[PDB]
Design a protein around this nucleic acid. Sequence first.
DNA 1: AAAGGGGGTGTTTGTGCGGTGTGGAGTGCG
DNA 2: AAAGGGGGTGTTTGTGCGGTGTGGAGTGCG
Lengths: 639, 639
Amino acid sequence: RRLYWDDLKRKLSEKLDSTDFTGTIKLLNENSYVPREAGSQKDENLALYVENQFREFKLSKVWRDQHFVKIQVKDSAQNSVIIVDKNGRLVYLVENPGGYVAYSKAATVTGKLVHANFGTKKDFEDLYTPVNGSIVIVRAGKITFAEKVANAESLNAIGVLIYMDQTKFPIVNAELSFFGHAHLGTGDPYTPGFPSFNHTQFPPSRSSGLPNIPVQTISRAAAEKLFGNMEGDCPSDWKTDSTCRMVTSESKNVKLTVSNVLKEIKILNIFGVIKGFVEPDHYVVVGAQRDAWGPGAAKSGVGTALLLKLAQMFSDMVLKDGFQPSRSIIFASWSAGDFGSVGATEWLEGYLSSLHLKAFTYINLDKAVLGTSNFKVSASPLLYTLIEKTMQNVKHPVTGQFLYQDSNWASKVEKLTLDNAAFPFLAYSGIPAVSFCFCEDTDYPYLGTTMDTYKELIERIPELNKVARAAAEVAGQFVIKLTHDVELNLDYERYNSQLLSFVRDLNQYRADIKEMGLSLQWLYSARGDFFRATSRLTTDFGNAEKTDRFVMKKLNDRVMRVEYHFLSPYVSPKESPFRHVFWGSGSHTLPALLENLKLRKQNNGAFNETLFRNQLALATWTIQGAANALSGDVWDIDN
Amino acid sequence: RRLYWDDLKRKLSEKLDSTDFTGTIKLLNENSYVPREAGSQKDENLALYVENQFREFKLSKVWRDQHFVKIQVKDSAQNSVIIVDKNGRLVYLVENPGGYVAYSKAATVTGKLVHANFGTKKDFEDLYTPVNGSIVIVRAGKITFAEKVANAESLNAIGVLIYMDQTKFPIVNAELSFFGHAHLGTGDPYTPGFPSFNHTQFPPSRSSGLPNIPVQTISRAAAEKLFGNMEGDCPSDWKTDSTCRMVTSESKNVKLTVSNVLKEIKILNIFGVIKGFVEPDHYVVVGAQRDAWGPGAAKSGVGTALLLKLAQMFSDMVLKDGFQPSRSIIFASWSAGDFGSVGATEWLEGYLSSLHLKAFTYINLDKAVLGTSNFKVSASPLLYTLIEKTMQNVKHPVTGQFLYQDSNWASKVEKLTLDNAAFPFLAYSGIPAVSFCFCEDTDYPYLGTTMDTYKELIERIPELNKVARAAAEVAGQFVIKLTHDVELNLDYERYNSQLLSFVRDLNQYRADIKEMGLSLQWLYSARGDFFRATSRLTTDFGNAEKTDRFVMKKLNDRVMRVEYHFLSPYVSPKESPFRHVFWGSGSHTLPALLENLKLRKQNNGAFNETLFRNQLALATWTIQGAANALSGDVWDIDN
DNA sequence: AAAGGGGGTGTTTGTGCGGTGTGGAGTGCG
DNA sequence: AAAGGGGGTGTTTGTGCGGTGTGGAGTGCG
Ligand SMILES: *[C@@H]1O[C@H](CO)[C@@H](O[C@@H]2O[C@H](CO)[C@@H](O)[C@H](O)[C@H]2NC(C)=O)[C@H](O)[C@H]1NC(C)=O
Ligand SMILES: *[C@@H]1O[C@H](CO)[C@@H](O[C@@H]2O[C@H](CO)[C@@H](O)[C@H](O)[C@H]2NC(C)=O)[C@H](O)[C@H]1NC(C)=O
Ligand SMILES: *[C@@H]1O[C@H](CO)[C@@H](O[C@@H]2O[C@H](CO)[C@@H](O)[C@H](O)[C@H]2NC(C)=O)[C@H](O)[C@H]1NC(C)=O
Ligand SMILES: *[C@@H]1O[C@H](CO)[C@@H](O[C@@H]2O[C@H](CO)[C@@H](O)[C@H](O)[C@H]2NC(C)=O)[C@H](O)[C@H]1NC(C)=O
Ligand SMILES: *[C@@H]1O[C@H](CO)[C@@H](O)[C@H](O)[C@H]1NC(C)=O
Ligand SMILES: *[C@@H]1O[C@H](CO)[C@@H](O)[C@H](O)[C@H]1NC(C)=O
Ligand SMILES: [Mg+2]
Ligand SMILES: [Mg+2]
Ligand SMILES: [Mg+2]
Ligand SMILES: [Mg+2]
């Protein structure tokens, strides 16, 4: 190898030092590209610009991907929130919101309005007033809109109102309207599990994650108007405004009118590839959402700029600096990401067989520059060692210190959530995924609104160029170290900590497990067997000669199957897309098993004996099968 | 390569010429090994003998596999079939059968007895007397017992009686009792989809294929006694005995008492491996059922003898003749095969992650010598070219002619059925599977009875040694050509015929498809795309250098994914184990789509519009995704 | 009979071929 | 207090360690 890690890192750094990220973001926030709603003309214009840029970079191949998806848009009739008397007579209009929640059911609901803090399950459980047959008003944040709506609907609430409170969203003007989607999932909600291509002819199907109650986003002024008609006083545990109130007066009601209409649109996914020199059929996917409801400077402008600049720099290094990737690099520009990563999920569903054990890592650039105080990572454990090594190399954009300051950062990593485009890659496809951001201690206030302009981003983050340079540096080092080395730099040994944590959590209910005719010895043995398999694999890697391309291919295939073997092989990928037992959603996951067992502990009566027994069996054998497959040949398994 | 195909074929032939198959079968039918019911002491003794033989052959590794499965056995109380009056009073006992149907519901049912020909759906549809609230009596054969019971149960019959008629089973004595199982599936019916290991702790689960009505096998004398109390005359279209009758007299009823009890038993799967010299992690599995209800000479003795002799010959060639397999060879001795390939299916479920894309072919030796007139093959299309090449080489055991006599043999190959141990490998695991037999035009009469002794086999098939030698020759040539060549000898191009046949069958309902807002252009394009992918792969194989181990590994992996890509990625592997869209069972298969569309054509009212639309979408995209994955890299797909 | 349709084969993938009235490769009939 | 239990850590996978009353690696208390 003419270029080693040090020389290639230096080349990446000197490419970054002469890159104008601020100019690219400013160009992406031009009037020719905003507003940039999914399937619009501006979205298609930016897709064509991205495609022409990928062609200008002289990538190995540039190709398009058209999907026809169903999304919700505002009707000609305006959604309205209205205070009505006990007899339904008009009192006074509250607000005709400018924003809306996509995939909210188009319906009119009237009833009492009661306040939940954030819509989390703890907020609903610890709430004095029962939320049934009543509209719940929740504050935006701490969970996705879909989670809030699902939690409210599971308690038989007839509607949801969402607003951004002053404390958590210190926006100066209270009339600002924002956008979200209430689909508890990813992709097109009307083509669950299948690619939504013309080939399917779009059969009548409907995802179970679609809400059945109206959902509406209202401005802070509208929320204060509603609180003016309420009585209860919010608890101090909710660090919210003093104007916030709990329950509507007994002589008033709220009529929520939602009339969003489904629209079928064409979304483009733009791809470019830098084909590898040793193993081109294996690749790292680098993706960034392109669409945005408003201007989307931080929502999609920063990610698209990072994608374009990374593609340019990597093409320059491969073509001019002599960089020779062993694997390929795919640069993906997703569309319809504001509706739940629709483009990425439909691409994953369309090409699942082609991406199976070929794409071994997804890097998400969405909202990578969102602030400057903290560097936050949510990723698969396989990427923890790579992230730690990158953090020890990349300096902080503002302070001269390296990003690696906390030795225990890995124990504070948040699980990937539905709002992240890396979640479909990890939980559904079993491809290790990483999402990182430079963020503050608080959520970005303008994210998802009409004030998410480039001017606001450059005002909130002066020296945005350096922060974007640092984000592109960590992403480029990810790509280089995942693609140039003879080893994949995926740490299968990091799942030993995950299994230990699961065993420790499950040991809290040993009395409950002993009350049933069950035992934890099989899960203990599975944890030990997985550790032994990882140690065997590390010994094999150490013994193998690096120049021997065959044995290293075998070992790298064993490493690539690690994340796939944690997808549940017992649930329907159509009904339960997120089959990952660690990071997926559904009763097949380990957290669901722990939740069911905790329900048994509380003696609430909602515990399901048979469901828990099946969960324990399937989880135990999923872990044991992952260990067995990682160990080696079928005859080498101990039992 | 010191040894080429000709020299190695000659070595195999000269090893076979000095092999005593008759002696091995006679030894396996000794009193120390019969009767050999699953989980019994004789079954364990034969498992230990097989393990000691594998160790004596000096195979690379010999290992065991213990499963604890639930099977049905006869109670202390005898099952009885009784003729009763209209008031339920005893008339006279018909028979206390010596055999039974495993997994039949233990219940007592009384009602009218009506005759269906074989229990096939056509037999029930074309039957004058409605079979509801009545016991149906069917002839054994032409479909599995489970299929008969499911067909009867779907029409609300309260019980099933099975007998072997004189015409189809020319057994001299009419008192012979036989055995079967009524589980519409494979594996342990009480651990559906999961390995049934101690790790699962055996949660409360139940397969949907278990019948809910009593099922009993009765002797021919008992059936004639029952027909003596019947009135109707069977149609001449049923080529059955003249004694057969249709419907019970109006003044008589049949009381069927079944009291089978579940028993948990330990079954052993004995394995031996001959590790390859180039790609040991990939292997061909050669399997044979060991257990049998009776003596099981043809049911399990012949297959086990063939397995032992093949293992001996291949170990001798690898150790003494210099044969150097590129891949490995696994010799598997399954147990509990009489209950629906329980051992093989539980092994597949236990090690699904380890066998995934590692086992690329399963060869089934069960009932390979069952006669001498015909050579019958049921296999995956990927193995059709290998089977044809083997047939052109192997001479017929009796006549000097080669096995390949009919040029159109491939169009007459029967689909693998539930009674075959290769069916779980093909339909569930996506591993190409082959089952062959030397059989007559009629079913083996003693198969599954207490007269399936070695004496009957040697009387019915004189020169059994030569027929067993020919069966071992075709199996050994299968193993050699699948394992020695640098190419896998799997013909992906044979699925072009399957897709053409599917398109031709679907073209019969173009008017019905046009009546709905549907089109077949996507399936036509999928067929063409799959052909283009296969042609591209053949061109790549021709261009690639054989000595280049890396590119050939890549191409062979592309070939190995072919059968796996035809498993439906949209159904639950637990609820629908047989996910193969061609050879599986369920609404996800292409035959199910055709059946639904035919239901639309008949205007019966049972057609499901939404189900058919989803079926068409999912089948179209399964075929298109298989084509896309076979074509190559994701960027090389045309659209 | 005459102008246009559905139903048709089966390797050169072919899904076309609707305009001519049989024929691309294979092939009908109102 | 004394003999035996459930609950406990967290790399040397550790699932053990129940008999001693704290300790394997880490570590309580009736
Ligand atoms: C694929 O399906 C989409 C719709 O799902 C088709 O697009 C529509 O085409 C009709 C007729 O041309 C137009 O009236 C609609 O406005 C289109 N919808 C959109 C969202 O553009 C498309 O034509 C289909 N493609 C193919 C090749 O059949
Ligand atoms: C507990 O979970 C089991 C599933 O493990 C539920 O049983 C299922 O019930 C549905 C109908 O509601 C059936 O279609 C399934 O076949 C059942 N599965 C099994 C394995 O029994 C059961 O209903 C749950 N209990 C409660 C109280 O919700
Ligand atoms: C695995 O489970 C089986 C039963 O499913 C256990 O075997 C039973 O063990 C009990 C107690 O030793 C005996 O009374 C039964 O007769 C056994 N059943 C059979 C069919 O043999 C077995 O002990 C379990 N293995 C482990 C290691 O726990
Ligand atoms: C036709 O098939 C559909 C499935 O494609 C059936 O609809 C399902 O009905 C069950 C309850 O019976 C629900 O749990 C499923 O969610 C439904 N699925 C869908 C996609 O709708 C439908 O019932 C069938 N029709 C008939 C008459 O049997
Ligand atoms: C909520 O449930 C309680 C208990 O059944 C019921 O009394 C109450 O009326 C319900 N709420 C509404 C708005 O009906
Ligand atoms: C079978 O169904 C028909 C139609 O409902 C009914 O009349 C008849 O009684 C049923 N058979 C029995 C044995 O009840
Ligand atoms: Mg036509
Ligand atoms: Mg012609
Ligand atoms: Mg303990
Ligand atoms: Mg210590």
